[PDB]
Amino acid sequence: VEWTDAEKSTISAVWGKVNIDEIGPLALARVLIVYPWTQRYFGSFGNVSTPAAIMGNPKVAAHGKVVCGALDKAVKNMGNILATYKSLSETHANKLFVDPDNFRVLADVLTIVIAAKFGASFTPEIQATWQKFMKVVVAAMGSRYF
Amino acid sequence: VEWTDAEKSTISAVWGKVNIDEIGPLALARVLIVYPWTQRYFGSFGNVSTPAAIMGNPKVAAHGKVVCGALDKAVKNMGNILATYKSLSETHANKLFVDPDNFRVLADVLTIVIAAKFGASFTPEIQATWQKFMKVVVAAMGSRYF
Amino acid sequence: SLTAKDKSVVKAFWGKISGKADVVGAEALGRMLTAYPQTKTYFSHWADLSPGSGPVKKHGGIIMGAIGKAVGLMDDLVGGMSALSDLHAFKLRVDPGNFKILSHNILVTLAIHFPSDFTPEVHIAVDKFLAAVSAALADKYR
Amino acid sequence: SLTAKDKSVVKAFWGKISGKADVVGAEALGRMLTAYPQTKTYFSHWADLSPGSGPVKKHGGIIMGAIGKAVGLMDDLVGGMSALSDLHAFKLRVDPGNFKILSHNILVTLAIHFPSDFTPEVHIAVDKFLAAVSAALADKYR
Numbered sequence A, B: 001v002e003w004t005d006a007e008k009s010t011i012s013a014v015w016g017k018v019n020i021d022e023i024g025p026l027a028l029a030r031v032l033i034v035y036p037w038t039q040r041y042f043g044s045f046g047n048v049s050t051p052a053a054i055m056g057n058p059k060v061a062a063h064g065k066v067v068c069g070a071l072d073k074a075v076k077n078m079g080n081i082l083a084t085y086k087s088l089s090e091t092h093a094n095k096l097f098v099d100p101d102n103f104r105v106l107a108d109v110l111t112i113v114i115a116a117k118f119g120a121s122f123t124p125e126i127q128a129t130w131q132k133f134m135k136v137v138v139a140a141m142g143s144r145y146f
Numbered sequence C, D: 001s002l003t004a005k006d007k008s009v010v011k012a013f014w015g016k017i018s019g020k021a022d023v024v025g026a027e028a029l030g031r032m033l034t035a036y037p038q039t040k041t042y043f044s045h046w047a048d049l050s051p052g053s054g055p056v057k058k059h060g061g062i063i064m065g066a067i068g069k070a071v072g073l074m075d076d077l078v079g080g081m082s083a084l085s086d087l088h089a090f091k092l093r094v095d096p097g098n099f100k101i102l103s104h105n106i107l108v109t110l111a112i113h114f115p116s117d118f119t120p121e122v123h124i125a126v127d128k129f130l131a132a133v134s135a136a137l138a139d140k141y142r
Ligand code: HEM
Pocket: A038, A041, A042, A063, A066, A067, A068, A070, A071, A088, A091, A092, A096, A098, A102, A103, A106, A107, A141
């Protein structure tokens, strides 16, 4: 997408303050609780029934780190996010069968967890650039659904 | 967007059978009736209160031809729809203040009117290519909203 | 929020459409899978997801059937739709946003098969009703 | 579809948030206009649409106010929200889909100001309630 250098700086600055170990687990677990139908893909993870269960499931936490870790490549390739996630988009579409609208609520929830952790330093202006980035990421993750 | 020649042929074939004089008015008037809040931009057109009123308003019909006529350029520039509608997107954003989600329900309604007029020749496969095209057009119309 | 006018319109149009409901279902599902391929993610066990395939044709009549049943339950769709909601909510776990996609493909098919009967007036009422069936089905999700 | 648990959660969280509601409103509106610039189309008469502008700060407290009022009307939001629906539906003609955008910007602001209090449990309930206020407001559109 067409990105300015300032935009690029903002996104790297936000991602610099992100603790993958804290934010992934929280973001992922909050998605499973607020939109409980997304639990249908996490059958092998054991009990993802309740918040309490969800929030203490180790496989959930581990997966949260994986998902959030994968954003690093988006963060580091802002010129070509589409192409960087092509392959990832095909395993989601063809091996995992994740409804791509699910990437949209995840993006919203991640944003919400980030706001909780950054507080007031997550300014409206920063949130606007983060939301433009989230939108390209979401679109990239849902691009190989045919 | 990346379009194949077959896709390009499909879209031109559909647009070849479209009667701008019949389809614009119908599409526009059906939008104003099914999503009645879009009437708020058509104040100068007189009475757009009821279906009956809407369906006989000449200014509505005229505008329907204009809107639908403007798709010709999308149809003829499938490589660069974004750039072809840049200017149009700025008058909508800055002079008319049309909510861009409005372009989405229009696209749906147009598709519905086209299906009614083509009948069974509007195959699922054709509708799939028409929907990919509609999506680029909608995105292009909402691209200069800042 | 169905008004009595909405309900009388849906009922007058439905009596006219009821003989082709299986055809309409089959085709709306087919159209949805093909034009909105993200919905194909819920039917990955099915052999053929093409328009006209058996799985598709059978499942579409089942869905239309439930909607025709909903025309009789318009007074209490939430309560009427309760058990199917439960199913979609806890067994199938279908993201609710897919209900609107199906709805749009149903309107496209209705226009196609009943272009003269599918007027603006019929259009707005059936759209509201499909939205209310979607809402009823979504009710128990969380 | 608010359950009694949903309502008790919204009520326990709201008592805790009520003193900063104007701040929360002002900031959620500000965030929406800036991060979702398509919503700016409804406020084109306003002099300044920036976060912290007067128009924004005033209007956001007005919107939060109506929502705080909705916490007391949770039993009948459709009926409770009736007059404001009418307004949004016939005077303002605000596309209903903008209600969900505002809702998301309200959750972001709540997380920011009440990160410890805004738990998952609080999150899901308030999201449902905001969705139900949106629905109530949208009710009379057509
Ligand atoms: C924000 C966008 C997302 C990114 C970047 C992402 C990233 C990943 C990665 C890197 C993997 C590892 C597997 C592989 O290499 O193929 C994965 C697997 C997976 N993801 Fe996604 N994911 C995202 C969103 C989602 C969402 C929203 C869901 C479910 C609602 C989901 C469900 C899964 C599942 C079930 C697996 C495989 C689990 C396993 O076998 O360990 N992902 N994801």
